[PDB]
């Protein structure tokens, strides 16, 4: 219960958010609406969505990142992701999302 979490930080000039959970319809449901919150709450234009705890990501999870971007552009901000597992990494390049939201290995790319 209450498995999906988000570890938002801004205090070093980058809105880094360690997602804590995997992403199917039990969690993409929630990871979405909380990340749409995050995009509004976060004052840093630079979001680094650190997926270092995600491993599985379903089609509802894919569409969620596409939601998060569109809310970024509403908010006039950047949207970047980080910490790509073999799965997750593939599932960003699988729809060319790696050019849409960039991607980074680490904060040294971000």
From Swiss-Prot:
Phosphorylated on a serine residue. PROSITE patterns: STAS. Keywords: Phosphoprotein. GO terms for molecular function: anti-sigma factor antagonist activity. The modification Phosphoserine is found at residue 59. It comes from the Bacteria. Residues 4-110 form the STAS domain. SUPFAM superfamilies: SpoIIaa-like. Belongs to the anti-sigma-factor antagonist family. In the phosphorylated form it could act as an anti-anti-sigma factor that counteracts an anti-sigma factor and thus releases a sigma factor from inhibition. This is Putative anti-sigma factor antagonist TM_1442. It comes from Thermotoga maritima (strain ATCC 43589 / DSM 3109 / JCM 10099 / NBRC 100826 / MSB8).
